[PDB]
């Protein structure tokens, strides 16, 4: 059961191959390809939403 995913190349043959050998999941490689982010918990932790064009007060 092979897995073929996208390599990390620059933005103006682009694949790689991963076979998990060991039976656990602690024995995997690093998960270097997760770039999801949600910064509204720290930037906008407010109860009433505040539009950036309206006055906040």
């Amino acid at each position: 059961g092979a897995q073929v995913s996208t390599q990390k190349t620059g933005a103006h043959i682009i694949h790689y191959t991963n076979i998990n050998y060991y039976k656990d999941s602690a024995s995997n490689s690093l998960n270097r390809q997760d770039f999801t982010q949600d910064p509204s918990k720290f930037t906008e932790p407010v109860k009433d939403v505040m539009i950036k064009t309206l006055p906040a007060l």
Binding site: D24, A26, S27, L30, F35, Q37, T43, K52, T53
Partner: protein, 276 residues
């Protein structure tokens, strides 16, 4: 756009309107979301800049040394015994400790590497023929039987994991799952150890991860040799919760968060600037 790709600046024109994107209130505890195209005129550039090197797997995923374990082949004291030990804690070095006290709760799988470098002890003469020495690294869980001495049958590794290594080869590597009993590795534990608010304060009471016993498998050497075992932790599949402010003052103790006070930053001579 792809994931982790920073946003680009839209076009803008000379406005004259009742919309104020620059005026806000910090009293609400809300960081402003002002695009640069809100307070001036900008073009339409396209940003291909990825945020790859900022994620917690790319950030923490580099191996950092945590201990320097010294042992020998002829006992001279109890700091350079025939074996040694290391109570497992990542708070003895200054580099990795600061990277782990940037978040309150972490949950990471580990992989451990040992770089074991023998070196001949000074003596009158040194000429000998030595077989390649073999090292044993046993991991005693919290509560197991520790080896009181060399030539003891607690080193039998009957159930504890143990690695062996003949000198000259690649360094040993093993991977470790999330070994806690809670649901996250508490880097900070603001509390006591006993229920009557006494005992020991802080994260010492939560760090119960065992020991790590090093020894030479080879029984003798004609002239003794002092080995140095360095342990290289590297977190992977890491989650991180509740980010802390990064620590200003440098550390003092490996179990406390004791510190001396210092200024917040480096001082200049005047607040303004002067040049025409």
């Amino acid at each position: 756009r792809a994931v982790g790709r920073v946003a680009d600046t839209v076009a803008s024109g000379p406005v004259n309107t009742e919309q104020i994107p620059a005026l806000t209130a910090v009293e609400t505890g809300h960081t402003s979301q002002v695009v640069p195209s809100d307070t001036m005129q900008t073009r339409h550039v396209i940003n291909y800049h990825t945020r790859s090197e900022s994620s917690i797997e790319n950030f923490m995923g580099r191996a950092a040394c945590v201990y320097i374990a010294q042992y020998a082949t002829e006992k001279v004291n109890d700091e350079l015994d025939r074996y040694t030990n290391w109570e497992i804690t990542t708070r003895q070095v200054a580099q990795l400790r600061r990277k782990l006290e940037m978040f309150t709760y972490m949950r990471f799988d580990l992989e451990i590497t040992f770089v074991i470098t023998s070196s001949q002890r000074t003596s009158t003469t040194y000429a000998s023929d030595s077989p390649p020495l073999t090292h044993q690294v046993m991991y005693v869980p919290p509560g197991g039987p520790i080896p009181k001495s060399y030539e003891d049958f607690a080193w039998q590794t009957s159930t504890n994991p143990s690695v062996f290594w003949t000198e000259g080869n690649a360094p040993p590597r093993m991977s470790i799952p999330f070994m806690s009993v809670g649901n996250a590795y508490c880097n900070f534990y603001d509390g006591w150890s006993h229920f009557s608010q006494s005992g020991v304060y802080g994260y010492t009471t939560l760090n119960n991860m065992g020991h790590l016993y090093f020894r030479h498998v080879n029984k003798s050497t004609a002239y003794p040799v002092n080995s140095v075992a360095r342990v290289y932790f590297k977190p992977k599949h890491v989650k991180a919760w509740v980010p802390r402010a990064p620590r200003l003052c440098p550390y003092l103790k490996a179990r406390n968060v004791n510190f001396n006070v210092q200024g917040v930053t480096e001082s200049r001579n005047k607040i303004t600037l002067d040049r025409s």
